[PDB]
Design an enzyme around this catalytic site. Structure first.
Site, PDB file in Angstrom:
ATOM      1  N   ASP A   4      33.311  36.774  25.853  1.00 25.79           N
ATOM      2  CA  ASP A   4      34.215  37.655  25.147  1.00 25.79           C
ATOM      3  C   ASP A   4      35.261  36.932  24.281  1.00 25.79           C
ATOM      4  O   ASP A   4      36.171  37.542  23.710  1.00 25.79           O
ATOM      5  CB  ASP A   4      34.881  38.549  26.195  1.00 25.79           C
ATOM      6  CG  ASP A   4      35.850  37.851  27.132  1.00 25.79           C
ATOM      7  OD1 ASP A   4      35.899  36.636  27.178  1.00 25.79           O
ATOM      8  OD2 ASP A   4      36.573  38.533  27.857  1.00 25.79           O
ATOM      9  N   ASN A  54      41.335  33.074  33.908  1.00 25.65           N
ATOM     10  CA  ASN A  54      40.958  33.541  32.619  1.00 25.65           C
ATOM     11  C   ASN A  54      42.064  33.977  31.672  1.00 25.65           C
ATOM     12  O   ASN A  54      42.878  34.839  32.012  1.00 25.65           O
ATOM     13  CB  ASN A  54      40.019  34.517  33.110  1.00 25.65           C
ATOM     14  CG  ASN A  54      39.637  35.481  32.100  1.00 25.65           C
ATOM     15  OD1 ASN A  54      38.920  35.229  31.124  1.00 25.65           O
ATOM     16  ND2 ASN A  54      40.285  36.596  32.438  1.00 25.65           N
TER      17      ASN A  54
END
Length: 129
Positions: free
Chosen positions: A48, A59
Site C-alpha cells: 500500500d 507500520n
C-alpha cells in the site's frame, strides 16, 4: 543491531512485554523472529506504499511518521527512523499501543500466520529464567 534470541527476550521482559495484554514472552520473541529476524534495522515496504520498521515491523500507515505515507496517523507519535535503534524502548512502547488496539497480536500478520497456536515458549527455551 541483530539481537540474539535470549538477549531479545530479556530486553522485552525488562520493558514489560511478558504477559502484556495477556501475551507471554515467547509470543513476542516468535513475532520478532519472523518480522525482523531480530534485526533492529529491518525495513520492508508494504504494497500500500507504507513501510514497516524495526524489530517488530511497525507500520508507517498508522503508527510512526516516515514522511512518505499519504494518510499516516502517527499514533505512537514517533519518527519511524527512531524504531531502528539498538535500544528497543520506542518499539516496545509503540507495540504496547498496537496490541491494545482491539485485535491483539493478530495486528502482526507474521504472528497470526506463523506463531499463533504454536508452542511459542520454545522461543524462550534455555534463556535465563
Amino acid at each position: 543491531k541483530v539481537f540474539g534470541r535470549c538477549e531479545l527476550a530479556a530486553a522485552m521482559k525488562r520493558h514489560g512485554l511478558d504477559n502484556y495484554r495477556g501475551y507471554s514472552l515467547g509470543n513476542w520473541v516468535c513475532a520478532a523472529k519472523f518480522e525482523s529476524n531480530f534485526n533492529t534495522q529491518a525495513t520492508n515496504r508494504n504494497t500500500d506504499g507504507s513501510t514497516d520498521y524495526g524489530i517488530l515491523q511497525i507500520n508507517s500507515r498508522w503508527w510512526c511518521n516516515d514522511g512518505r505515507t499519504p494518510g499516516s496517523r502517527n499514533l505512537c507519535n514517533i519518527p519511524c527512523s527512531a524504531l531502528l535503534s539498538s535500544d528497543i524502548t520506542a518499539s516496545v512502547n509503540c507495540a504496547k499501543k498496537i496490541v491494545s488496539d482491539g485485535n491483539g497480536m493478530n495486528a502482526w500478520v507474521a504472528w497470526r500466520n506463523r506463531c499463533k497456536g504454536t508452542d511459542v515458549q520454545a522461543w524462550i527455551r534455555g534463556c535465563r529464567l
